[PDB]
Curated annotation (Swiss-Prot), chain B:
Species lineage: Viruses, Riboviria, Orthornavirae, Pisuviricota, Pisoniviricetes
Subunit structure: Binds to host ACE2. RBD also interacts with the N-linked glycan on 'Asn-90' of ACE2. Cleavage of S generates a polybasic C-terminal sequence on S1 that binds to host Neuropilin-1 (NRP1) and Neuropilin-2 (NRP2) receptors. Interacts with host integrin alpha-5/beta-1 (ITGA5:ITGB1) and with ACE2 in complex with integrin alpha-5/beta-1 (ITGA5:ITGB1). May interact via cytoplasmic c-terminus with M protein. May interact (via N-terminus) with host bilirubin and biliverdin, thereby preventing antibody binding to the SARS-CoV-2 spike NTD via an allosteric mechanism.
Entry function: Attaches the virion to the cell membrane by interacting with host receptor, initiating the infection. The major receptor is host ACE2. When S2/S2' has been cleaved, binding to the receptor triggers direct fusion at the cell membrane. When S2/S2' has not been cleaved, binding to the receptor results in internalization of the virus by endocytosis using host TFRC and GRM2 and leading to fusion of the virion membrane with the host endosomal membrane. Alternatively, may use NRP1/NRP2 and integrin as entry receptors.
The species this protein was found in: Severe acute respiratory syndrome coronavirus 2 (2019-nCoV)
Top-rank taxon, per record: Viruses
Protein name: Spike protein S1
UniProt effect for mutating residue 1 to T: In strain: Omicron/BQ.1.1, Omicron/XBB.1.5, Omicron/EG.5.1
Amino acid sequence: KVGGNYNYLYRLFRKSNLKPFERDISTEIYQAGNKPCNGVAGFNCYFPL
Amino acid sequence: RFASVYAWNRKRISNCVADYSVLYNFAPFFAFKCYGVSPTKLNDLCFTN
């Protein structure tokens, strides 16, 4: 679709490598570590999808 | 003092250990966008230049 097809997504980075045939329905934000992140933040607290 | 956009200042970096963390000593920048790589695992690889 022209600038669409948002229903198909992926994950560029995750907190840990997935196990064989492991499925993860949640999409929580990865923690930054060097700065307390609850909502939106910088270094490592971007949206994974 | 930074240079103009057409005369963009280019600097070559080689033969030195690059600490990708000192890049986050200040933090209001809105566009920390990395293409092709992840901003977290930058310390897990090495490049020639």
